[PDB]
Amino acid sequence: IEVLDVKTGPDSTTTIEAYLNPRVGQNWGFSTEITVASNGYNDAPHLTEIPCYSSARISLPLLNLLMWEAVSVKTEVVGISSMLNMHSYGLRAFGGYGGGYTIEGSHIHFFSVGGEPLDLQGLMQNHSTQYPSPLVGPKKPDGTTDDSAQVLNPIYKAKLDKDATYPIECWCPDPSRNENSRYFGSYTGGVETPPVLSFTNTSTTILLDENGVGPLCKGDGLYLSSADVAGTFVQQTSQKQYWRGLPRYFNITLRKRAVK
Amino acid sequence: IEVLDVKTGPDSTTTIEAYLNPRVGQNWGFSTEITVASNGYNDAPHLTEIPCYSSARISLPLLNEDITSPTLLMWEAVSVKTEVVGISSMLNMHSYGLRAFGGYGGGYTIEGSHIHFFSVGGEPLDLQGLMQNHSTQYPSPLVGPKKPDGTTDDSAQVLNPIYKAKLDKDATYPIECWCPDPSRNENSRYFGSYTGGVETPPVLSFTNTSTTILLDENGVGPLCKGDGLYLSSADVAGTFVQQTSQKQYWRGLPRYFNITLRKRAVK
Amino acid sequence: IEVLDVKTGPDSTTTIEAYLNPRVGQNWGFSTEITVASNGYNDAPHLTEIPCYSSARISLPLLNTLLMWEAVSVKTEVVGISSMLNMHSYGLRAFGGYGGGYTIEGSHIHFFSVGGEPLDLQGLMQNHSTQYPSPLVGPKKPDGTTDDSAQVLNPIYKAKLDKDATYPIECWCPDPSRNENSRYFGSYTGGVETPPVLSFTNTSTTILLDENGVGPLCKGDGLYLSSADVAGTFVQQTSQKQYWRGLPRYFNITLRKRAVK
Amino acid sequence: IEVLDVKTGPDSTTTIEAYLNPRVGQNWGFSTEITVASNGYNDAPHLTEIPCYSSARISLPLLNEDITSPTLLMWEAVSVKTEVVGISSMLNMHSYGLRAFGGYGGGYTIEGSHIHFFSVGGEPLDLQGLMQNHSTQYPSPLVGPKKPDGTTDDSAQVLNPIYKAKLDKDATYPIECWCPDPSRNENSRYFGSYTGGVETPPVLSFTNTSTTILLDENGVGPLCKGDGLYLSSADVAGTFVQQTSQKQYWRGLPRYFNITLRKRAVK
Amino acid sequence: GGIEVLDVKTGPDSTTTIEAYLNPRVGQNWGFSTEITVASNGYNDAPHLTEIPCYSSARISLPLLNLLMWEAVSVKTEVVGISSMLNMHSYGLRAFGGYGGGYTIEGSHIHFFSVGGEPLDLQGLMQNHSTQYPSPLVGPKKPDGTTDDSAQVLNPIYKAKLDKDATYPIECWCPDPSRNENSRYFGSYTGGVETPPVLSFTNTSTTILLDENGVGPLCKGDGLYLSSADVAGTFVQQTSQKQYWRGLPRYFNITLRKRAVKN
Ligand SMILES: CC(=O)N[C@H]1[C@H]([C@H](O)[C@H](O)CO)O[C@@](O)(C(=O)O)C[C@@H]1O
Ligand SMILES: CC(=O)N[C@H]1[C@H]([C@H](O)[C@H](O)CO)O[C@@](O)(C(=O)O)C[C@@H]1O
Ligand SMILES: CC(=O)N[C@H]1[C@H]([C@H](O)[C@H](O)CO)O[C@@](O)(C(=O)O)C[C@@H]1O
Ligand SMILES: CC(=O)N[C@H]1[C@H]([C@H](O)[C@H](O)CO)O[C@@](O)(C(=O)O)C[C@@H]1O
Ligand SMILES: [Cl-]
Ligand SMILES: [Cl-]
Ligand SMILES: [Cl-]
Ligand SMILES: [Cl-]
Ligand SMILES: [Cl-]
Ligand SMILES: [Cl-]
Ligand SMILES: [Mg+2]
């Protein structure tokens, strides 16, 4: 798009409220138990134990030479306070006499705002991982997945076009594309790593680029994406781990922009 | 409310000092022992083991005293100096703490998962329901996320708009099933940080030189409806781990507020 | 005090160098062994195992509209941080006893205040029933009692930091409802084996002027310094006993003459 | 080179996209098992267990000397957008990792000592020799710090100027015996962070909103000699710990570059 | 210093740069101490010369000027060979019950540098007043030759000038904040048993050495005084489970300019 003047005047700005609920393998914020393939056997995790990118397309007011331009977003991880819970069946500290473990371990927090689906690059820890249908993993055109999927091979790309479909563990945001999307992510590893999350209604993220242009919403659609895996729940007795996801709130400010 | 000019002149600004004491299940800064339901049994924690949001409504000086005035005035919260009081209380290795280095060392200082949170507003803080276990049984008089029919389904573990409340009572709304609602609270400013982990060390700073500005993108602060300033607090520093019993108790700290307000005109 | 113009000209500014040595229960940077009361028995720690606020009043040049010294800025440093790079002085030994001694570790607090009067203290303690030996001073009501409310905020429990080595860190914090004429700065870190992180440079400066460009005004021509620098605990091999370790704080205050009504 | 005016006008700026895949001893993001010499035996690690600097020379558009102009033109690297690709790949607790909570929990995510480093330059990055063990035996075709006589003495464990190299070959210079030479690299900008520890969690961020400025104290960027832009990378995220074997493997990640260059005149 | 400072001479040959490196002095000269030893409770604390890390220090000769003094304006400094620590094969204590790789350098660490126009002023403070430092090391002594309990806190009687490389132990001397008017110093210490070192390296950082009044260190006797203390942590050896201090070299690049002075 050749970008022109910013239309100002009445009915020239609008806000969009939306939330994305987490897709950690089931719909209620927890995966099924995390399983580990035995050395030499297939790496074939259960559908319901594999966290995926949350994604939605919000319909914007119809315009027509004008496109909605995303200027800023207020975003928050909802239900952080839910984790201050040491009674709900957690593995017990101090030889079983203390309280249950709060959510801990490896976690990722990520959001994107765009005028089109987020561009994904294929990269995974184990090229041989078997993702059950209907999940989508990095495949060559011939249907195979070789060792190169553990590093950067441009052959492995996708568009984040379906909720609860693209596993976090084999797709990252493609930095060679996403010209019309703004994305932000932080991953922390470790076995018992404590989650650190902040929440305030005073933060704002500017979405304008080096040249003061925001994401331009093609087909009058605003594209939100989320991945908020706070860590794992560790259950007493079973000592099994479950991925715990949290919902993300969005508040996008858009304005009318003219295009050639 | 259509916001107008900021009235300046004498008696046009005022300060409010307040403190909120913590409500961690009892009134003296400690919960009763944290209990854990056995797998397959009801998750039914004791009233006195469940930390709640502290909350108060401070009465502000009367405004629309002048029966001739052409414009209504509301107090506008501009800035707050806030401090977590008694942080230094935690430098204590003699008061019955689980003992380090095979029992020959000093007692454990407060450690583990902690949350620190405050809000200033012109009305009660808007809460969204979200909890780790939808089936948790909160004893009366605590209030948890319920649908209109009285039930609580699996959706309460993620975002379902059906689960909302106003933080209208002290020591009543559990921290673990209510968070600030980011879809509302237009007339409140809230700030929170949570840290998880089993033995995580609390890190807290204290100074009388910090100030938090409460004005929004458009230079408007919280406007105090009914001449009431609404303070909220949640300062669970971590857990006390007791020697011998090896039981854990939530430890809360009080929060000090110093709000600067000014008169603002409204249509 | 109604504050007026800042007197400028010769002999209108001065600097004060001072150090506060730590008061961790003895005078040489270590407490006696930390003891823990048995559940159900009195919580009665030894005088020499309880760290206290360090405090001094520096005498300023006599001045006498009246003039008061105004504290503008302070360069401050925690002295002897490098002293902790020591793995040979009797520390509990790592890697099954074959490695070096534990460096100072565990819960620590670092705090300083500059003021024109004694620092205002608020009473708050972990255990209301703690018995502080004389001559230490703990939160008492006027009647001499100490109730459960001392574990949260009760305004009845206040004091002025008017004596060195007297006010325990564990039952007194800076009172944020007062200290209009003091500037205080403090950071506490908990944990059992938490590593201390301390920096030192002669390039840092802390401005002491308030929202209205007024610094602490030194009443009775006295500058009031306060310190609490408990770097952590020393863990001794064999005994596996813990001792509080304190460090001294250096102050360099710049003051200027200010007029008052 | 005497640096002159910045040529502006049409065809005077250009961008370069590139990626460097990691060289951790094999080409698919993992080393072979990390081995440890027995005390008193040779320190002789396998070729395929030794991570190396990734490196490439990107060809820039040829800049043709104008016999009427008084001044030659060189490409000047102004800014770089760079990202560590496939960070999200590490949120994997099913792919054969050593299992937590006595073997009943999920596999360990990548953890332990890690280094993240990138350089942009108008020539090969200048390397200084420094290694933990001077006696380490690097198999051919790797290149380690050698004196002219072929030996490597104790001084290679500190700074000896005799041990220098140019990062002129991919997958060749081990990270563990070469660092960026701060006494040179006038025409390169380099950025690195190392974290030690046994089980240290990696912390990595990713966004398409970050930019690193490459201009120096005097507003001059790397000047690309022979119309070549020199990229270097070292992104060892940590180790994979395998269940049962309890063997460790270095895990590398690819780095994306997006360099903005402009024409600069030189005497 | 006690020099009255005047105008900054500008013009040709009025600025110069100095490149230098200080190699670490952790008790031997090749980046490692001998094994760390621990006195038994009740016995003398008498560590080996070669197990005690010391401040690195050098005096660089500047071009002769004559009044004019060289003024240190800025320094680019870097800890060299950080990447050397990404080594899990060189005899380190082995992780995951001995089946994993060797421990990288870990534990308590200090990183420190100073630039000055004279030797760095040191204050005596030590963890154990009774520590016995072998000759030729220099520890805090009173004039009478003794060292009392006061050396564990601040006693002004215990001072020294960092006038010799590999001589002043880090563990009993810190920079004296009551002096060093003509030096700029910067240090960070981290404790703990297994604490991971975190070090960054870039040729884009610069540290300004000018004070509150835009005056840098003035190099007395046409000498620039560099000091370093970079103990990255300890090496933990498999089988022996003994610990060795590991030091790293520091690179300096100082920019100086001519400054005029009275008297
Ligand atoms: C990643 C993976 O391959 N998971 C597999 C698990 C793991 O072996 C468990 O960890 C056993 O504890 O076992 C299965 O039999 C199962 O539970 O259905 C098959 C499944 O494909
Ligand atoms: C969270 C919860 O449900 N707590 C329950 C506990 C836990 O199961 C104990 O930790 C093990 O008995 O048990 C009770 O008998 C109790 O102690 O009062 C009932 C209570 O409902
Ligand atoms: C660094 C080093 O010298 N490693 C040597 C190792 C290790 O001692 C063991 O693998 C212990 O893990 O032993 C070898 O037989 C091997 O595996 O190839 C030879 C190799 O040269
Ligand atoms: C700091 C110190 O005083 N170290 C002493 C050590 C340690 O006690 C042992 O290495 C640990 O048992 O013992 C010595 O015999 C030695 O190693 O030469 C004398 C030495 O003076
Ligand atoms: Cl939605
Ligand atoms: Cl009050
Ligand atoms: Cl208790
Ligand atoms: Cl906060
Ligand atoms: Cl501080
Ligand atoms: Cl593998
Ligand atoms: Mg009336």
PDB file of N, CA and C in Angstrom, chain B residues 17 19 21 28 30 83 86 88-96 101 104-106 109 111 201-208 243 251 254 256, chain C residues 34-35 37 39 41 43 107 124 126 151-153 155 169-170 172-173 176-177 179 182 184-192 239-240 242 244:
ATOM      1  N   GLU B  17      -4.056  11.398  53.824  1.00  0.00           N
ATOM      2  CA  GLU B  17      -3.245  10.287  54.398  1.00  0.00           C
ATOM      3  C   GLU B  17      -4.200   9.160  54.786  1.00  0.00           C
ATOM      4  N   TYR B  19      -3.954   4.479  55.572  1.00  0.00           N
ATOM      5  CA  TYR B  19      -3.256   3.172  55.504  1.00  0.00           C
ATOM      6  C   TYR B  19      -4.331   2.098  55.360  1.00  0.00           C
ATOM      7  N   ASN B  21      -4.480  -1.887  56.310  1.00  0.00           N
ATOM      8  CA  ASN B  21      -3.872  -3.085  56.940  1.00  0.00           C
ATOM      9  C   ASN B  21      -4.234  -4.290  56.079  1.00  0.00           C
ATOM     10  N   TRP B  28      -4.014  -9.675  61.882  1.00  0.00           N
ATOM     11  CA  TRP B  28      -2.720  -9.338  62.536  1.00  0.00           C
ATOM     12  C   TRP B  28      -1.548  -9.805  61.665  1.00  0.00           C
ATOM     13  N   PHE B  30      -0.944 -12.355  59.588  1.00  0.00           N
ATOM     14  CA  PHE B  30      -0.749 -13.790  59.247  1.00  0.00           C
ATOM     15  C   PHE B  30      -2.089 -14.497  59.081  1.00  0.00           C
ATOM     16  N   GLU B  83       3.706   3.514  50.062  1.00  0.00           N
ATOM     17  CA  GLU B  83       4.818   2.721  50.642  1.00  0.00           C
ATOM     18  C   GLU B  83       4.260   1.460  51.299  1.00  0.00           C
ATOM     19  N   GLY B  86       6.640  -1.696  57.113  1.00  0.00           N
ATOM     20  CA  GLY B  86       7.139  -2.831  57.909  1.00  0.00           C
ATOM     21  C   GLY B  86       7.865  -3.862  57.063  1.00  0.00           C
ATOM     22  N   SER B  88      11.073  -3.913  56.838  1.00  0.00           N
ATOM     23  CA  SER B  88      12.228  -4.194  57.738  1.00  0.00           C
ATOM     24  C   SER B  88      11.860  -5.287  58.747  1.00  0.00           C
ATOM     25  N   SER B  89      10.564  -5.515  58.992  1.00  0.00           N
ATOM     26  CA  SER B  89      10.051  -6.528  59.958  1.00  0.00           C
ATOM     27  C   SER B  89      10.549  -7.927  59.574  1.00  0.00           C
ATOM     28  N   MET B  90      10.885  -8.130  58.297  1.00  0.00           N
ATOM     29  CA  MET B  90      11.266  -9.448  57.724  1.00  0.00           C
ATOM     30  C   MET B  90      12.733  -9.785  58.035  1.00  0.00           C
ATOM     31  N   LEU B  91      13.566  -8.830  58.464  1.00  0.00           N
ATOM     32  CA  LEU B  91      14.975  -9.122  58.865  1.00  0.00           C
ATOM     33  C   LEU B  91      14.966  -9.729  60.275  1.00  0.00           C
ATOM     34  N   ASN B  92      14.400 -10.935  60.393  1.00  0.00           N
ATOM     35  CA  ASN B  92      14.114 -11.631  61.678  1.00  0.00           C
ATOM     36  C   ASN B  92      14.356 -13.127  61.455  1.00  0.00           C
ATOM     37  N   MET B  93      15.430 -13.664  62.046  1.00  0.00           N
ATOM     38  CA  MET B  93      15.808 -15.090  61.891  1.00  0.00           C
ATOM     39  C   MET B  93      15.722 -15.826  63.228  1.00  0.00           C
ATOM     40  N   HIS B  94      14.976 -15.287  64.198  1.00  0.00           N
ATOM     41  CA  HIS B  94      14.872 -15.852  65.574  1.00  0.00           C
ATOM     42  C   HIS B  94      13.430 -16.240  65.929  1.00  0.00           C
ATOM     43  N   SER B  95      12.423 -15.724  65.219  1.00  0.00           N
ATOM     44  CA  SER B  95      10.988 -15.888  65.572  1.00  0.00           C
ATOM     45  C   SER B  95      10.406 -17.149  64.921  1.00  0.00           C
ATOM     46  N   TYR B  96      10.928 -18.314  65.317  1.00  0.00           N
ATOM     47  CA  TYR B  96      10.309 -19.662  65.178  1.00  0.00           C
ATOM     48  C   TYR B  96      10.373 -20.178  63.735  1.00  0.00           C
ATOM     49  N   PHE B 101      20.555 -24.866  57.292  1.00  0.00           N
ATOM     50  CA  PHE B 101      21.822 -25.613  57.492  1.00  0.00           C
ATOM     51  C   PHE B 101      21.601 -26.705  58.547  1.00  0.00           C
ATOM     52  N   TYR B 104      20.855 -25.958  62.485  1.00  0.00           N
ATOM     53  CA  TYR B 104      21.883 -25.280  63.324  1.00  0.00           C
ATOM     54  C   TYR B 104      21.923 -23.775  63.033  1.00  0.00           C
ATOM     55  N   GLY B 105      21.404 -23.357  61.873  1.00  0.00           N
ATOM     56  CA  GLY B 105      21.377 -21.946  61.439  1.00  0.00           C
ATOM     57  C   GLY B 105      20.152 -21.217  61.978  1.00  0.00           C
ATOM     58  N   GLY B 106      19.863 -20.038  61.419  1.00  0.00           N
ATOM     59  CA  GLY B 106      18.731 -19.188  61.819  1.00  0.00           C
ATOM     60  C   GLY B 106      17.446 -19.587  61.120  1.00  0.00           C
ATOM     61  N   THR B 109      13.474 -16.387  56.834  1.00  0.00           N
ATOM     62  CA  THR B 109      12.711 -15.131  56.626  1.00  0.00           C
ATOM     63  C   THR B 109      11.555 -15.437  55.682  1.00  0.00           C
ATOM     64  N   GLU B 111       9.362 -15.935  52.697  1.00  0.00           N
ATOM     65  CA  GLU B 111       9.743 -16.296  51.308  1.00  0.00           C
ATOM     66  C   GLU B 111       8.563 -16.967  50.605  1.00  0.00           C
ATOM     67  N   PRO B 201      12.740 -15.230  47.100  1.00  0.00           N
ATOM     68  CA  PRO B 201      12.979 -14.148  48.050  1.00  0.00           C
ATOM     69  C   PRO B 201      12.169 -12.921  47.665  1.00  0.00           C
ATOM     70  N   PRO B 202      11.439 -12.304  48.610  1.00  0.00           N
ATOM     71  CA  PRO B 202      10.828 -11.000  48.368  1.00  0.00           C
ATOM     72  C   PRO B 202      11.919  -9.927  48.219  1.00  0.00           C
ATOM     73  N   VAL B 203      11.718  -9.020  47.269  1.00  0.00           N
ATOM     74  CA  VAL B 203      12.563  -7.813  47.041  1.00  0.00           C
ATOM     75  C   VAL B 203      11.625  -6.615  47.105  1.00  0.00           C
ATOM     76  N   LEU B 204      11.736  -5.800  48.153  1.00  0.00           N
ATOM     77  CA  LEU B 204      10.882  -4.598  48.356  1.00  0.00           C
ATOM     78  C   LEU B 204      11.782  -3.411  48.699  1.00  0.00           C
ATOM     79  N   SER B 205      11.485  -2.254  48.102  1.00  0.00           N
ATOM     80  CA  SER B 205      12.173  -0.968  48.364  1.00  0.00           C
ATOM     81  C   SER B 205      11.219  -0.017  49.087  1.00  0.00           C
ATOM     82  N   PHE B 206      11.775   0.938  49.825  1.00  0.00           N
ATOM     83  CA  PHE B 206      10.992   1.956  50.559  1.00  0.00           C
ATOM     84  C   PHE B 206      11.767   3.275  50.557  1.00  0.00           C
ATOM     85  N   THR B 207      11.081   4.358  50.182  1.00  0.00           N
ATOM     86  CA  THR B 207      11.613   5.743  50.147  1.00  0.00           C
ATOM     87  C   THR B 207      10.444   6.727  50.218  1.00  0.00           C
ATOM     88  N   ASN B 208      10.670   7.900  50.809  1.00  0.00           N
ATOM     89  CA  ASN B 208       9.661   8.992  50.845  1.00  0.00           C
ATOM     90  C   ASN B 208       9.928   9.973  49.691  1.00  0.00           C
ATOM     91  N   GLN B 243       9.329 -23.766  61.975  1.00  0.00           N
ATOM     92  CA  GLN B 243      10.158 -24.931  62.385  1.00  0.00           C
ATOM     93  C   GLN B 243       9.238 -26.023  62.938  1.00  0.00           C
ATOM     94  N   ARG B 251       1.843 -14.140  54.917  1.00  0.00           N
ATOM     95  CA  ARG B 251       2.254 -12.921  55.659  1.00  0.00           C
ATOM     96  C   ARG B 251       1.889 -11.694  54.815  1.00  0.00           C
ATOM     97  N   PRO B 254       0.986  -3.787  55.620  1.00  0.00           N
ATOM     98  CA  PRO B 254       0.112  -2.644  55.399  1.00  0.00           C
ATOM     99  C   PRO B 254       0.698  -1.728  54.316  1.00  0.00           C
ATOM    100  N   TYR B 256       0.710   2.335  53.001  1.00  0.00           N
ATOM    101  CA  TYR B 256       0.456   3.769  53.278  1.00  0.00           C
ATOM    102  C   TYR B 256       0.126   4.475  51.962  1.00  0.00           C
TER     103      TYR B 256
ATOM    104  N   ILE C  34      23.004 -16.401  65.708  1.00  0.00           N
ATOM    105  CA  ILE C  34      21.528 -16.249  65.618  1.00  0.00           C
ATOM    106  C   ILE C  34      20.913 -17.463  66.308  1.00  0.00           C
ATOM    107  N   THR C  35      20.001 -17.236  67.247  1.00  0.00           N
ATOM    108  CA  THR C  35      19.279 -18.298  67.997  1.00  0.00           C
ATOM    109  C   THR C  35      17.809 -18.265  67.593  1.00  0.00           C
ATOM    110  N   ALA C  37      14.028 -19.442  69.152  1.00  0.00           N
ATOM    111  CA  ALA C  37      13.141 -19.922  70.234  1.00  0.00           C
ATOM    112  C   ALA C  37      12.445 -21.205  69.772  1.00  0.00           C
ATOM    113  N   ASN C  39       9.229 -23.607  69.486  1.00  0.00           N
ATOM    114  CA  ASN C  39       7.764 -23.356  69.390  1.00  0.00           C
ATOM    115  C   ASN C  39       7.164 -23.473  70.791  1.00  0.00           C
ATOM    116  N   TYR C  41       7.719 -21.595  73.470  1.00  0.00           N
ATOM    117  CA  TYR C  41       8.576 -20.921  74.480  1.00  0.00           C
ATOM    118  C   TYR C  41       8.699 -19.437  74.132  1.00  0.00           C
ATOM    119  N   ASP C  43      10.057 -15.998  72.814  1.00  0.00           N
ATOM    120  CA  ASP C  43      10.954 -15.447  71.769  1.00  0.00           C
ATOM    121  C   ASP C  43      11.833 -14.380  72.420  1.00  0.00           C
ATOM    122  N   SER C 107      19.277 -13.245  53.666  1.00  0.00           N
ATOM    123  CA  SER C 107      18.458 -12.018  53.757  1.00  0.00           C
ATOM    124  C   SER C 107      19.345 -10.839  54.157  1.00  0.00           C
ATOM    125  N   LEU C 124       6.547  -1.795  63.538  1.00  0.00           N
ATOM    126  CA  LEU C 124       5.967  -3.012  62.916  1.00  0.00           C
ATOM    127  C   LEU C 124       6.987  -4.146  63.024  1.00  0.00           C
ATOM    128  N   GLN C 126       7.470  -8.823  63.271  1.00  0.00           N
ATOM    129  CA  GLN C 126       6.960 -10.145  62.816  1.00  0.00           C
ATOM    130  C   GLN C 126       6.227 -10.842  63.968  1.00  0.00           C
ATOM    131  N   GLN C 151       2.016  -6.121  64.580  1.00  0.00           N
ATOM    132  CA  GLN C 151       2.405  -6.967  63.418  1.00  0.00           C
ATOM    133  C   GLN C 151       1.841  -6.361  62.131  1.00  0.00           C
ATOM    134  N   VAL C 152       0.997  -5.340  62.262  1.00  0.00           N
ATOM    135  CA  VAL C 152       0.490  -4.522  61.126  1.00  0.00           C
ATOM    136  C   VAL C 152       0.704  -3.053  61.489  1.00  0.00           C
ATOM    137  N   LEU C 153      -0.017  -2.126  60.856  1.00  0.00           N
ATOM    138  CA  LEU C 153       0.135  -0.682  61.154  1.00  0.00           C
ATOM    139  C   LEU C 153      -0.855  -0.295  62.254  1.00  0.00           C
ATOM    140  N   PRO C 155      -0.861   3.256  64.496  1.00  0.00           N
ATOM    141  CA  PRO C 155      -0.207   4.540  64.770  1.00  0.00           C
ATOM    142  C   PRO C 155       0.271   4.752  66.213  1.00  0.00           C
ATOM    143  N   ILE C 169      16.220  -3.051  63.756  1.00  0.00           N
ATOM    144  CA  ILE C 169      15.737  -2.961  62.350  1.00  0.00           C
ATOM    145  C   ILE C 169      14.426  -3.743  62.231  1.00  0.00           C
ATOM    146  N   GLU C 170      14.271  -4.813  63.019  1.00  0.00           N
ATOM    147  CA  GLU C 170      13.225  -5.846  62.797  1.00  0.00           C
ATOM    148  C   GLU C 170      11.863  -5.404  63.352  1.00  0.00           C
ATOM    149  N   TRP C 172      11.185  -1.660  63.764  1.00  0.00           N
ATOM    150  CA  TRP C 172      11.036  -0.235  63.356  1.00  0.00           C
ATOM    151  C   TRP C 172      11.341  -0.064  61.864  1.00  0.00           C
ATOM    152  N   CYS C 173      10.449   0.594  61.130  1.00  0.00           N
ATOM    153  CA  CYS C 173      10.709   1.070  59.749  1.00  0.00           C
ATOM    154  C   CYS C 173      10.539   2.587  59.705  1.00  0.00           C
ATOM    155  N   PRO C 176       6.295   6.714  56.966  1.00  0.00           N
ATOM    156  CA  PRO C 176       6.023   7.482  55.752  1.00  0.00           C
ATOM    157  C   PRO C 176       4.980   8.585  55.965  1.00  0.00           C
ATOM    158  N   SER C 177       4.311   8.581  57.125  1.00  0.00           N
ATOM    159  CA  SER C 177       3.282   9.578  57.528  1.00  0.00           C
ATOM    160  C   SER C 177       3.964  10.824  58.102  1.00  0.00           C
ATOM    161  N   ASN C 179       8.500  12.330  58.644  1.00  0.00           N
ATOM    162  CA  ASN C 179       9.801  12.480  57.946  1.00  0.00           C
ATOM    163  C   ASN C 179       9.693  13.527  56.824  1.00  0.00           C
ATOM    164  N   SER C 182      13.228  14.803  56.432  1.00  0.00           N
ATOM    165  CA  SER C 182      14.238  13.736  56.197  1.00  0.00           C
ATOM    166  C   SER C 182      14.010  13.136  54.807  1.00  0.00           C
ATOM    167  N   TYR C 184      14.783   9.407  53.044  1.00  0.00           N
ATOM    168  CA  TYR C 184      15.237   8.023  53.339  1.00  0.00           C
ATOM    169  C   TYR C 184      15.071   7.136  52.103  1.00  0.00           C
ATOM    170  N   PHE C 185      15.952   6.140  52.015  1.00  0.00           N
ATOM    171  CA  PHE C 185      16.101   5.201  50.877  1.00  0.00           C
ATOM    172  C   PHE C 185      16.496   3.823  51.420  1.00  0.00           C
ATOM    173  N   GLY C 186      15.712   2.795  51.117  1.00  0.00           N
ATOM    174  CA  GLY C 186      15.949   1.440  51.640  1.00  0.00           C
ATOM    175  C   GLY C 186      15.501   0.363  50.697  1.00  0.00           C
ATOM    176  N   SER C 187      16.217  -0.759  50.695  1.00  0.00           N
ATOM    177  CA  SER C 187      15.886  -1.965  49.895  1.00  0.00           C
ATOM    178  C   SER C 187      16.199  -3.214  50.725  1.00  0.00           C
ATOM    179  N   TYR C 188      15.202  -4.086  50.895  1.00  0.00           N
ATOM    180  CA  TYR C 188      15.332  -5.391  51.602  1.00  0.00           C
ATOM    181  C   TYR C 188      15.192  -6.512  50.573  1.00  0.00           C
ATOM    182  N   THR C 189      15.995  -7.562  50.735  1.00  0.00           N
ATOM    183  CA  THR C 189      15.899  -8.830  49.974  1.00  0.00           C
ATOM    184  C   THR C 189      15.876  -9.995  50.969  1.00  0.00           C
ATOM    185  N   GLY C 190      14.893 -10.894  50.847  1.00  0.00           N
ATOM    186  CA  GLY C 190      14.756 -12.082  51.708  1.00  0.00           C
ATOM    187  C   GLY C 190      15.546 -13.267  51.167  1.00  0.00           C
ATOM    188  N   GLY C 191      15.160 -14.479  51.577  1.00  0.00           N
ATOM    189  CA  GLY C 191      15.728 -15.751  51.096  1.00  0.00           C
ATOM    190  C   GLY C 191      16.733 -16.328  52.073  1.00  0.00           C
ATOM    191  N   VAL C 192      17.088 -17.603  51.887  1.00  0.00           N
ATOM    192  CA  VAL C 192      17.947 -18.370  52.837  1.00  0.00           C
ATOM    193  C   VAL C 192      19.413 -18.216  52.426  1.00  0.00           C
ATOM    194  N   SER C 239      30.000 -25.854  63.010  1.00  0.00           N
ATOM    195  CA  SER C 239      28.886 -25.379  63.878  1.00  0.00           C
ATOM    196  C   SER C 239      27.614 -25.226  63.036  1.00  0.00           C
ATOM    197  N   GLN C 240      27.766 -24.794  61.779  1.00  0.00           N
ATOM    198  CA  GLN C 240      26.660 -24.451  60.843  1.00  0.00           C
ATOM    199  C   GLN C 240      25.760 -23.395  61.498  1.00  0.00           C
ATOM    200  N   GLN C 242      24.834 -19.274  62.090  1.00  0.00           N
ATOM    201  CA  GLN C 242      24.776 -18.057  61.244  1.00  0.00           C
ATOM    202  C   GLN C 242      25.003 -16.830  62.128  1.00  0.00           C
ATOM    203  N   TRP C 244      24.877 -12.462  61.663  1.00  0.00           N
ATOM    204  CA  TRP C 244      24.620 -11.225  60.884  1.00  0.00           C
ATOM    205  C   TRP C 244      25.956 -10.531  60.612  1.00  0.00           C
TER     206      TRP C 244
END
